[model samples]
Target chain A: HMKKNIFHNVSLYEIIFSDNGNTLTLSFTDTIEGNYFGYIKCSNILNFKLDTNNFVDYEDKEDSLFPLFIPEIELYKYQFYSEIIIDVGIIIKISAETINFEPL
Target chain B: HMKKNIFHNVSLYEIIFSDNGNTLTLSFTDTIEGNYFGYIKCSNILNFKLDTNNFVDYEDKEDSLFPLFIPEIELYKYQFYSEIIIDVGIIIKISAETINFEPLGK
Candidate 1:
């Protein structure tokens, strides 16, 4: 099993519900402008997976007083996977196997 | 045939092609930040419509010397509609009946 750390950033701004509560309009920010990305239904998800990592490998360092969360080094991580139905009568499955997260 | 002046603003910034050139990833700025909105196939579009208005109805202004492109007044317009298939296993149809354009805006 090749273990690799993948990181991403996302910001969600708005959401709209329709179809008597069956449809959803998700709006978010990514680059230079805001956008309405997708129309989704909660019941449309075929499979969903969420995973989080909390364990950290304490490394011994010479001339160090305490362990450090090194910059460019990822520790805690989150993973999300889903089979989603997009528009135009199509189905797509996507995954974020090794996603990094920061505590707020 | 209810002729009403509806208006909107939109911008297209990025695009990606996938699935043997069958899929497209479109990115744009709408409200804030930026987003990768959807994956679309050119062959997936069932129907499309495009319209534009170049002739402006010059309203009579009694006091003004020249007619102005009134603010909050929509002159040239565009509209788009499509039937799309999202992820998972569903088909959805959407439309923008009336859309407005601007030379530039902050």
Candidate 2:
């Protein structure tokens, strides 16, 4: 399990196996009084299924297609299967599992 | 019947009386390559019923409540009623009526 030590006040939330294929987006709201640190780690996530290393750095409108990836990553094909673990001592840790693809 | 035509390239979409109460959000995707032209008119809107004479001027997070108005416009309570007509050509026309509360914000 990949883990990052985070020191801050924040609420971490996770949305996985979204409408798309094997893709998950992790969003968090940080309310730290001062600067803080954090880390993320995923297991069983195929490196090929990994599309974005740092999605937080991007915004919707800034990238047309909005929530959808600009390249249209095929989550429906990779048969994505992975687990996400968020470790931050400030508030709470988030965890979830999913496989990439659309339900028939 | 209030009508004003705008010269530009865009598709206008409207969402009204969403989750909250009687609120409507008019959004248009503009594709004008160069400078464009447009205008807005609301002939049947009540003065007091109008929450933000300039809503587009404000943003959520910039406020608190995100999509919910910072002041909670109360499209739910004001017994609100209004009609909007946006005139922009290049695609289609958008028209709607509502009271204003939820769904989306400027």
Using TM-score, give the best candidate's number. 2
TM-score of the A chain in model 2: 0.27
lDDT of 2 by residue, B1-106 (tens): 2322232343332222212111224334334442222223321222211111222222232321112211111112223333332211111122222322212322
In the range B28-47, model 1's lDDT, one tens digit per residue, is 33433433222223322222
Q: Docking quality tier of candidate 1?
A: incorrect
DockQ of 2: 0.01
Q: Per-model C-alpha lDDT, please?
A: 0.25, 0.25
Docking class of 2: incorrect
TM-score of each: 0.17, 0.18
Positional deviation of A55 in candidate 2, in angstroms?
46
Worst 10 residues of 2 chain B by lDDT: B65-74
Per-candidate fnat, comma-separated: 0.00, 0.00
Model 2 ranges with Cα > 4 A deviation:
A1-104, B13-19, B33-106
- State the displacement of the C-alpha of residue B21, model 2, in Å, after optimal TM-score superposition: 3.3
User: Second chain TM-score per prediction?
Assistant: 0.26, 0.26
Residue B78 of model 2, lDDT score: 24
Per-residue error at A24 for model 1, in Å? 2.8
Candidate 2 lDDT score relative to the true structure: 0.25
